[PDB]
């Protein structure tokens, strides 16, 4: 159970609540609760005293010059939900909305937001009950409009607000009746407390980072399989090389490779600096093998940097104005700008493209007899069935997906419109669509990694057959990559045996079904993910 | 003075040597000098014993399958200079080439490259004598070809090598004569020791990072001028706001802006928390002022991350193979792949475009009476000459430059050709052209920042006039921005005066001349750079 | 000789005047010359009568709300030169500036601009005398600022204007003195007549289109060399194939390749339709040969479309307001927006990157023995000197240039700033920087094509040798590609000979010198350009 108010949330915390339905509860720490209440009292007294506060006793953004009376102060926040009910396009994944709610709640616990504890708690109840508001993919320039949908569902403002109640679509007032809750009415500032901020884009981004850390670990395993299938050397990953060029990510990737290849019987074992003289001539490994740590270093380091930045944002107070009860003051600031998210997700998409292109080049070596060091063309299985073309179709599909991934590696934060919202929002982060685009990259990268996994699994079977009599690669692989191999072969439903490789005749499988099954297992955190669990 | 190989080099160190002609010397540490010699010993014995070593007793890259005898091993390295080099197209700044020679020599001191000390010393001599080999902008997929022009010049291989000898173009053999040096012939491995590696792209990147750090400080100062001109508040930068979203770069940007604005007579001083008129009523600032530290944060942190990555690359051993004397072995590795440089410069150009775009929307506020809070249209000075249009042309020029900077913020590392060099280099970093594009970005950004300074300086004069009798902003400005303001007007040669603003009639200056003077001063590290020295 | 305004100007016409110094003269057509005078008459009466006309009796752009009297109307135009111009940063090729003055003068002959004939004649005098005003590369969001440097120079406004007087830098007033001309002062509207419009960006674009058409022809010739070197078939270009997919550009590319390859002794001549060995068995060509006309088609048609669009822009009236003498009226319109240029150059740069990428994969086939069908590795000439590595360095340099060209194939028109010039210019074309980026693209492409020519020439020599006794490819080549081959080797100064290929030892040339010579020749319209003259 994740406790919200007392500690810092991690990306892993957010993914557990978001995807695994881990329960959540608000802290009962007495000072935190008091800070929450103090914040509301300050706002209550300011409104009554006719203190002028943008968005609380006056209008919003470019219409903040519009005066709002005390009698209309609550109605201002309520109406904020209505004129923001303007989303468009497809729905977010529920897991992203759950993440959004968890972050919104966390942000309120700091007590600078002036929102009722009963309203914070409503997010805890939705999360634990399995109620997820629908939220559209269009509407935020980086999260008013997405958040208004969460807000209107929480307070049950109107039947046009829809929720998913454990797989059941229904309207929000109906959901409140089932939970035995009452409709809520927003008090001054509460609308801004719910809707001003970065919770959705950061929630999306958090899940993207989690998914990409996992996909990177799996990618490392694929490369390890590729290297073993190509009969490449492990000399490339020797600590002496990387200690003298000590980028943290290069160091890490090289050292992870040593572990991944340790006790393999398929690599050239040359860590003593000397050629093994076991095949018919001396081979040098191409750059995609030799320069693998240098290439992945900045990606590994970048993802780690994004993860650090996204975790600050997770634990940030992001609405506005901010209430300082210690000095009885409020400040008109800008924490609702999700610039670390916009730029971070630009970087992430770019990194995913770089990962994919490197993997596709490995596949090009495996598939091509000129470069595969003895592997059959296109990793053909049954040689006596001449019509067999092996994994030729699977490569083309790989070739169709990677460039799309580099395409999404283009940036969007730099294309923000400077005329936005009556020229009030003349900079903005484009963080929201940047995050949804990242979700798209990650989803596509999951299919891509599935394909790469299939190539590596076939390939080590065929290499094993070259080295030994037979096709069961389990004995021959390094123990670390044996777990992944076996996990893939389990998920796909094709057991390793000494007499057949993973793929034998083109006739005997739909490769598409194997792609879908591996992808689904990666996304679910199945045995493939668990196989590479130790690569942090 | 800068001692090469007993201490890590910083980016400041590199810029001092490259730009300011700081003297350089090789360490006399007895241990270091033995490492350098032991490395040569190992190699020249390995070759004499007929060990197979790629690139040393064998051909290069895709032609590593070609065996090279004991007797041709030396000529192998000499010929590498001929086919490699002399593949080049257009021409790079001498300071970048000086940076490269410093980096190359620095990497050799580690004692793993198997290169003669007198070859290393020749880079020291060239640096202190001011002999700079000509290097072309095309030829490296990320430094064989660039480094070979340096190598051919150092050893005085042929008259077709041009150097710049403190201003004098010469052929290299002639430069050697005047320095009283003999030509050198490369021994086995020494060609690779000179031409394998990331020294030139990293040399370029290092100067770019240094310049971009300077421009970020100046940009901070420009924003501080803009805010004062616009009668903005300092409330947005209150630490209560930023402590509750504690990204390091955001915290830093807000704190710096507090310092930059302290004791200004031109800002609305609302750090109390409460409002009221010295203008309209209540005034709400637009996002480009209010969300400034949120926006600059990831740019600041990003430049800092690149800085840290480039300093590691600066102090790395990047040639190949690497000689490990303690275990008497060579390793065929890949430290010549400068992925941190190709990706880092992709990020740098992207950050610079975001800085420029933000500055440009401040210029839009300043120029437009709807948004300037009482400044004249286009920062017009003499309103009585009605044909005056003020800084309208200056704005258009700004508007033409900023989009070009976001254009250069496109990435190039992801567009690497997988068929490079006989399909041997099937991944590569594009780090060299990434770095020269960054240089182009930085150079354009110096022009842009010049314009933005001109806008800020004019504007505070006009705001001062609105407020007081006069046009001399020096007394009204925060002391921090007064330093910058005076420095700018010192450079353009237009003295502050209580009777006239910086720009009075359109008649009286070529603004093009002011831009050029301010840019030159920024490039030379002049008084404008010295005014913002405080900003780390 | 080129007569300005009684005939449409073509892109050939523009290049002849800009590059070859062709003499120019204004039409003496009595009707045209009356139109020009009637236009001035209308305007100078309208002003004298106090008509409100934007930019004529009122301020400019966002300051059009400022009224300008009869008495200051002339000074209004003179001052436009001062605030506009003199907003500029870095410097453009004289030929582009000559193109601009031709275009500007050409637009005035239509008689709708209200500008004095002696002002128009001054562009004629400058062109024929070889006086070229200095113009900077920054300042236009797509030509006020560039055109104002031309204007100030033409009228001799101030010594701060520099011109190039056939090689001599001068101030403009001094150039006027030597030409025996008086300074001019602008009359109402004449400033706009000179500085409103798309003449400079279109002048640049025109030279780019001309150069790109040349390089496309040369590229066709390079492919024809590549195909012959690779022992490719001409079957792929059979009209039965292309008639059944009849895109004009594809039809054209296939037919041209048939001509380029006719009577070659180096291709497999399979236009019959049936196969067989003069090699392996049956040989299938890869897509870069087989799909060549399908690939080049849209590039060819695209360049042709741009050509047609630019010629309309060339012959357009682009200033404002436009005087319609027949109805005695002015129209406030928008012909100064050069969207066809900003978008056309976006497309051009994109096409050029696609041409380069295609050429680069041919170079990969040539360099690699797995794919070259029997050519030596890296097109090595003297195989007995084992330290020779042939064109390996040349390939790497090619590999560094091509990705930069696809990089410049990114677009800039979509990145226009909507806040430009007091929010008056809330759309703009970015046409000027689009065009200067195209110039940068074209210039880099000339270097790239040089490399590709060097590869093709070497390769056919080596293929000829495989086939016959000797290295002289002249007899074996199709007559069409023999012209190109000889032209290239004339330029680099290495005569075909039966005993030695173009490149024998790495020892014996600086390949950098060959690239530079071939590029210079391509730029100057030399023998290499004349060899491919036949390709329309
Ligand atoms: O704080 C601001 O400047 C904008 C707040 C806001 C709230 C709801 C809609 C638009 C803007
Ligand atoms: O593969 C390598 O490590 C060397 C590649 C290379 C290519 C051309 C010249 C020197 C080295
Ligand atoms: O809006 C227009 O048509 C003119 C814009 C303009 C701006 C600055 C100088 C001349 C014209």
Author numbering:
A (entry chain B), B (entry chain A), C (entry chain A): 25 to 166, 170 to 563
Task: Pull verbatim passages from the article behind this deposition.
Enzymes with phenylalanine ammonia lyase (PAL) activity are able to catalyse non-oxidative deamination to yield cinnamate (1a) and ammonia from the proteinogenic amino acid L-phenylalanine (L-Phe, 2a). PALs also find use in the area of green chemistry and sustainable pharmaceutical manufacture as industrial biocatalysts, due to the reversibility of the deamination reaction. Although several crystal structures of PAL enzymes have been solved, none exists with the natural ligand trans-cinnamic acid bound in the active site, thereby preventing correct and unambiguous assignment of the phenylalanine-specific MIO-dependent ammonia lyase zymophore.
The gene encoding AvPAL was mutated, incorporating two surface substitutions (C503S and C565S, known to aid crystallisation) and replacement of the loop tyrosine with a catalytically inert but shape-complementary phenylalanine (Y78F). The triple variant was purified and co-crystallised with the natural deamination product. Superimposition of these two structures revealed excellent complementarity with a few small differences between the unoccupied and occupied active sites. The only backbone displacement was a shift in the outer active site loop, with the fully closed conformation from the previously reported structure seen to clash with the inner active site position 78 in the co-crystallised protein. In the case of the unoccupied enzyme, the amino acid at position 78 is tyrosine which points inward toward the active site, providing no contact with the outer loop, whereas the new structure features Y78F with a dihedral swing of ~140° causing the bulky side chain to protrude outwards. Other differences included H359 moving into the active site sphere in the cinnamate bound structure, along with smaller shifts in the positions of Q311 and R317 (SI). Presumably these represent movements which occur upon substrate binding, although they may be induced instead by the Y78F variation as exchange of polar and non-polar residues in the inner active site loop of related enzymes has been reported to influence conformational dynamics. Visualisation of the occupied active site allowed the identification of 19 residues within a 6 Å sphere of the ligand, including the MIO and catalytic amino acid at position 78, the carboxyl positioning residues, the hydrophobic aryl binding pocket and other assorted substrate-constraining side chains. The 19 amino acid active-site sequence motif, as inferred from the AvPAL-cinnamate structure, was used to distinguish potentially useful enzyme sequences from other family members.
